[PDB]
Design a protein around this motif. Structure first.
Motif, PDB file in Angstrom:
ATOM      1  N   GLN A  42      51.224  53.268   4.511  1.00 38.51           N
ATOM      2  CA  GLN A  42      51.261  51.817   4.639  1.00 38.51           C
ATOM      3  C   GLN A  42      49.998  51.166   5.133  1.00 38.51           C
ATOM      4  N   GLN A  79      53.907  43.498   7.986  1.00 36.92           N
ATOM      5  CA  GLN A  79      55.261  43.939   7.611  1.00 36.92           C
ATOM      6  C   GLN A  79      56.268  43.683   8.739  1.00 36.92           C
ATOM      7  N   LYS A  82      56.996  39.847   8.549  1.00 43.23           N
ATOM      8  CA  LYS A  82      57.816  39.580   7.378  1.00 43.23           C
ATOM      9  C   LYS A  82      59.287  40.012   7.602  1.00 43.23           C
ATOM     10  N   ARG A  90      59.624  35.402  -1.743  1.00 41.85           N
ATOM     11  CA  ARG A  90      58.222  35.771  -1.518  1.00 41.85           C
ATOM     12  C   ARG A  90      57.268  34.791  -2.159  1.00 41.85           C
ATOM     13  N   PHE A  92      52.993  32.719  -1.610  1.00 44.75           N
ATOM     14  CA  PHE A  92      51.704  32.668  -0.903  1.00 44.75           C
ATOM     15  C   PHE A  92      51.830  31.901   0.436  1.00 44.75           C
ATOM     16  N   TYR A 123      64.195  47.886   6.555  1.00 49.75           N
ATOM     17  CA  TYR A 123      65.323  48.396   5.777  1.00 49.75           C
ATOM     18  C   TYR A 123      65.022  49.724   5.124  1.00 49.75           C
ATOM     19  N   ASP A 126      71.198  51.784   2.572  1.00 47.14           N
ATOM     20  CA  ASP A 126      72.530  52.067   3.123  1.00 47.14           C
ATOM     21  C   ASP A 126      72.775  51.476   4.520  1.00 47.14           C
ATOM     22  N   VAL A 165      60.821  52.755   2.104  1.00 46.22           N
ATOM     23  CA  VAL A 165      60.840  51.380   2.603  1.00 46.22           C
ATOM     24  C   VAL A 165      60.165  50.390   1.663  1.00 46.22           C
ATOM     25  N   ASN A 166      59.440  50.882   0.645  1.00 45.54           N
ATOM     26  CA  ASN A 166      58.794  50.011  -0.349  1.00 45.54           C
ATOM     27  C   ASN A 166      59.828  49.473  -1.333  1.00 45.54           C
ATOM     28  N   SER A 169      66.457  49.797  -1.763  1.00 42.14           N
ATOM     29  CA  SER A 169      67.693  49.679  -2.525  1.00 42.14           C
ATOM     30  C   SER A 169      67.570  50.418  -3.851  1.00 42.14           C
TER      31      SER A 169
END
Ligand SMILES: C=C(C/C=C(/C)CCC=C(C)C)CCC(C)(C)/C=C/CC/C(C)=C\CO[C@H](COP(=O)(O)O[C@H]1O[C@H](C(N)=O)[C@@](C)(O)[C@H](OC(N)=O)[C@H]1O[C@@H]1O[C@H](CO[C@@H]2O[C@H](CO)[C@@H](O)[C@H](O)[C@H]2O)[C@@H](O[C@@H]2O[C@H](C)[C@@H](O[C@@H]3O[C@H](C(=O)NC4=C(O)C=CC4=O)[C@H](O)[C@H](O)[C@H]3O)[C@H](O)[C@H]2NC(C)=O)[C@H](O)[C@H]1NC(C)=O)C(=O)O
Ligand SMILES: CCCCCCCCCCCC(=O)OC[C@H](O)CO
Length: 210
Positions: A42, A79, A82, A90, A92, A123, A126, A165-166, A169
């Motif tokens: 990251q 991050q 955010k 998302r 600018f 996140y 799950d 994490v990127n 889901s």
């Protein structure tokens, strides 16, 4: 559902409430290769910059023709901001506000505090918003380096979660897509190049992945 650990950031001390999560684990309490899995994937110069990495980004861009040193769009500090702000579209303007607030987070907190807010409020999939919750849920392992009770998160599992994490889901641990296993493979290579792991660990992890 992690709404309680989100807000508008009227004060940067709002991040301190992440410390009361039941599965909270301090960055100080994690093995180096665990933190390195996230740092390498990251934001490699996380400890060295002031939340923006302007110098390193500019070199990666214009020192070599290769994209070898090019990283993703956001430092760990950006991050954290955010993920603390409520889920939103998302754009600018929101990214710019995040950059501004990242400067305020860097001013107040040390790198281990920032890294703890990071790993305990992102996140993983799950319904897991902590690295300990994720390691427990997915592997039944722990990121607390002091545990004598639980199996310790492996090098592979650390890279799997740092890449997950990127797209938490989409990236599926049980049925890994070719793209997800390419991301994890690159993560393992970066951990080796940045000296968080050695050849033995790297090969053991690549063998386990294959
Ligand atoms: C200064 C200048 C220069 C300008 C000029 C003009 C020059 C000036 C010159 C002059 C004046 C001379 C301006 C330029 C500057 C400043 C650089 C500006 C840039 C502009 C950038 C732009 C355009 C925008 C900014 O935004 C961009 C994009 O932001 P993001 O989309 O947030 O970031 C993602 O992409 C980045 C990237 N492209 O580089 C990234 C790789 O850096 C981010 O990676 C990290 N590590 O941050 C990446 O973030 C990840 O993105 C995932 C989503 O991916 C996106 O998914 C979209 C689909 O919805 C796709 O369209 C996108 O392509 C894709 O990127 C985050 O995951 C989401 O996490 C949520 C929490 C999940 O939701 C939950 O899901 C739960 C659930 O059940 N899930 C499930 C399970 O668990 C299992 C099955 C499930 O269904 C529940 O439903 C729950 O209710 C729900 O809330 C949700 O499901 C989950 N989604 C996915 C796909 O996994 C995931 O949580 C999130 N990770 C973190 C840590 O934030 C940016 O900041 O770069
Ligand atoms: C969960 C049920 C929804 C189907 C998508 C599965 C998926 O890719 O989720 C990723 C998973 O949390 C990690 O292994």
């Amino acid at each position: 559902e992690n709404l309680y650990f989100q807000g508008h950031m009227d004060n940067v001390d709002e991040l301190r409430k992440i410390e009361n999560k039941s599965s909270f684990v301090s960055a100080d309490n994690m093995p180096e290769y665990v933190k390195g899995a996230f740092i390498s994937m990251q934001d490699e110069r996380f400890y060295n910059h002031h939340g923006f990495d302007l110098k390193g980004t500019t070199r990666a861009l214009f020192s070599t023709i290769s994209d070898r040193d090019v990283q993703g769009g956001s430092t760990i500090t950006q991050q954290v901001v955010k993920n603390y702000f409520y889920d939103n579209d998302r754009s600018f303007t929101r990214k710019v506000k995040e950059l501004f607030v990242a400067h305020r987070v860097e001013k107040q907190y040390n790198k281990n505090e920032i890294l703890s807010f990071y790993l305990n409020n992102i996140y993983f999939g799950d319904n897991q918003y902590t690295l300990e919750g994720a390691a427990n849920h997915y592997f039944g392992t722990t990121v607390n380096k002091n545990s004598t009770t639980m199996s310790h998160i492996t090098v592979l599992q650390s890279a799997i979660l740092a890449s997950k994490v990127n797209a938490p889901s989409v990236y599926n641990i049980n049925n890994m897509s070719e793209n997800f296993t390419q991301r994890v493979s690159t993560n393992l290579e970066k951990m080796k190049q940045q000296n968080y792991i050695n050849e033995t660990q790297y090969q053991q992890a690549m063998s386990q992945l294959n």
